Curated annotation (Swiss-Prot):
It is found in: Cell junction, Focal adhesion; Cell junction, Adherens junction; Cell membrane; Endoplasmic reticulum membrane. This is Syntenin-1. Expressed in lung cancers, including adenocarcinoma, squamous cell carcinoma and small-cell carcinoma (at protein level). Widely expressed. Expressed in fetal kidney, liver, lung and brain. In adult highest expression in heart and placenta. Residues 7-86, 91-166 form the PDZ domain. It comes from the Eukaryota. The gene is SDCBP. It comes from Homo sapiens (Human). Keywords: Acetylation, Cell junction, Cell membrane, Cytoplasm, Cytoskeleton, Endoplasmic reticulum, Lipid-binding, Membrane, Nucleus, Phosphoprotein, Repeat, Secreted. Its main location: other. The keyword Cell membrane applies.
Length: 191
């Protein structure tokens, strides 16, 4: 998680889409969905990011509907957004043991127990937290089996980005799990 704010610049695609859904939280605006192969993913927008401004207008207090309406009505050539990086999230680094385990149990992508004497224990990983990313890869909407598979195919060093469950549950509201699984960007970013 980068500390502080960055400016991103966007162009709508030929269809006039940027590939975002936004959600009002605590009088802020946050990214609920980034679509794969979209201007938004291309410029490195991520689930959980806060949008402070769009074309220099503060988003403070805006409804979801208003944020979307503003985006729809913007001239598509250049859209500037001011972004604070995944403010509700933290990243933890763990080392797999000899058996290839980091030391936790999860269910629906939510951590439910920490294993005694594990790397996850030593690093103070918490329960009641949803897994958002693994080694920088968005894993929101994947089956637990796909998440476990990604953990195995990682090196010895595993970084996890987590979010407190209650906040996660609030961000993903008004969205069917089949949309989240199918449409949320899970690609590794392109250079």
């Amino acid at each position: 998680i980068k500390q502080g704010i960055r400016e991103v610049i966007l162009c709508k695609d030929q269809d006039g889409k940027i590939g975002l859904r936004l959600k009002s939280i605590d009088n802020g605006i946050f990214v609920q969905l980034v679509q794969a192969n979209s201007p938004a993913s291309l410029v490195g927008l991520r689930f959980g990011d806060q949008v402070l401004q769009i074309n220099g207008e503060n988003c403070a207090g805006w409804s979801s509907d208003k944020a979307h309406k503003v985006l729809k009505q913007a001239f598509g050539e250049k859209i500037t957004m001011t972004i604070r990086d995944r403010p509700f999230e933290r990243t933890i680094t763990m080392h797999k043991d000899s058996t290839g385990h980091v030391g936790f149990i999860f269910k629906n992508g939510k951590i439910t127990s920490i294993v005694k004497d594990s790397s996850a224990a030593r690093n103070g990983l918490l329960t009641e937290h949803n897994i958002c990313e693994i080694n920088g890869q968005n894993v929101i909407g994947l089956k637990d089996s796909q998440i476990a598979d990604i953990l195995s195919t990682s090196g010895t060093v595993v970084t996890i980005t987590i979010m407190p469950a209650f906040i996660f549950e609030h961000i993903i509201k008004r969205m069917a799990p089949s949309i989240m699984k199918s449409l949320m960007d899970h690609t590794i970013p392109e250079v």
